[PDB]
């Protein structure tokens, strides 16, 4: 069972409206309050000046908490700062910020002076979503209440969003900035904007993970249940005789392609000139929730599955079955030879 969340790059654009309030006193100056806010940048800004010219305005026009507000950085008129990369850090993805300090009013004695600050920050993170891929998270701890695959083309509108259509715009033929045409995907959450290269859901996600590639997996039907014994990985699975229809596995598209590639690679590497495939690859569902893609050989002569967290049941099954085959075979030979000895000694 795939418990690895969906992972993909994502670009977070926001202006840190961090307004400060300062008092200048008779002998020294102290704050009265500092408000910080994360302000979204409109779609048109990301397209026209983040993607095209790598600049960003000194104003952050956004509707904050049911009111439209813009913040003139420097407390001066609007100006578009050339974006620049942030200072270095250890294993953090690339970030970029226009402003590098915070504006503060010059001292005027015994007066209350308010100080604004806008740092139009562009930062790239990696996003993470989990089934049902209803909404996804970004590294900064924030959220985006919408499926990673929501959009317009190819039934993307089916996938869940939790925003009015105005907040969610999409670019076709998007040219990624040098900071190949793409299909970029932007949402203006009440704090920021997230852009990730939109991709079709079913091919780009899966609820099953390729766990192992057994080069030799003996199969033996027994007691109305298949036994899948792998001497290489020391494991013996058990499944029902009926195959497992892939249509029942939710978002199981990856299984067919990954399986096919794995059996083809293994066949080329080891069984190209010794065996021949018999029938198209089969799929069985094992105890402990292990979908098995099985490709029988011969010598030239809708739901979600749940997987256990302990192979040790299956490894015990394999060890016990191996030892039992051996001891049963050997004690059977002993008993047969003992009968033959008795009948032979009768003379």
């Amino acid at each position: 069972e795939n418990i690895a969340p969906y992972k993909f790059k994502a670009t977070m654009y926001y202006k840190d409206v961090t307004v400060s309030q300062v008092w200048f006193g008779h002998r020294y100056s102290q704050f009265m309050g500092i408000f910080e806010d994360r302000a979204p940048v409109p779609f048109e800004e990301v397209i026209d000046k983040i993607n095209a010219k790598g600049v960003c305005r000194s104003t952050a026009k956004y509707v904050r908490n049911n009111l439209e507000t813009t913040a003139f950085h420097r407390d001066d008129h609007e100006t578009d700062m050339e974006l620049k990369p942030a200072n270095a850090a250890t294993r953090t993805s690339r970030g970029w910020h226009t402003t590098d300090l915070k504006y503060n009013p010059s001292r005027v004695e015994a007066f209350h002076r308010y100080g604004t600050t806008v740092n139009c920050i562009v930062e790239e993170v990696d996003a993470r979503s989990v089934y049902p891929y209803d909404e996804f998270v970004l590294a900064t701890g924030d959220f985006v209440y919408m499926s990673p695959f929501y959009g317009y083309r190819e039934g993307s509108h089916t996938e869940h969003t939790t925003y009015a259509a105005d907040r969610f715009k999409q670019v076709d033929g998007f040219y990624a900035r040098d900071l190949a045409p793409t299909t970029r995907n932007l949402l203006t959450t009440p704090k920021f904007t997230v852009a990730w290269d939109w991709v079709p859901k079913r091919p780009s996600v899966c609820t099953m993970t390729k766990w192992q590639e057994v080069d030799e997996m003996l199969r033996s039907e027994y007691g109305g249940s298949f036994r899948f014994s792998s001497d290489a990985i020391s494991t013996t699975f058990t499944t029902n005789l009926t195959e497992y229809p892939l249509s029942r596995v939710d978002l199981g598209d990856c299984i067919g392609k990954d399986a096919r590639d794995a059996m083809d690679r293994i066949f080329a590497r080891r069984y190209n000139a010794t065996h021949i495939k018999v029938g198209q690859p089969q799929y069985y569902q094992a105890n402990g929730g292990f979908l098995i893609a099985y490709q029988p050989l011969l010598s030239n002569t809708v739901e979600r599955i749940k997987t256990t967290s302990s192979i040790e049941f299956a490894r015990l099954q394999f060890t016990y079955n191996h030892i039992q085959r051996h001891v049963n075979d050997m004690l059977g030979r002993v008993a047969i030879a003992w009968c033959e000895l008795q009948n032979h000694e009768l003379t």
């Binding site: 049911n66 959220f143 256990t308 049941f313």
Partner: protein
């Protein structure tokens, strides 16, 4: 041999009192659920 777990990974995850996902997922719905993030008022 049936699969056996003293503690499935779900209850192991649930053993924690809180978690980022649930906790501030709810904490940032708070604005969406209990306020409008689209209506604009000018006067």
């Amino acid at each position: 041999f049936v699969p056996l777990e003293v503690y499935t990974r779900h209850e192991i995850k649930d053993s924690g009192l809180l978690d980022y996902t649930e906790v501030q997922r709810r904490n940032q719905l708070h604005d969406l659920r209990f306020a409008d993030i689209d209506t604009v008022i000018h006067a």
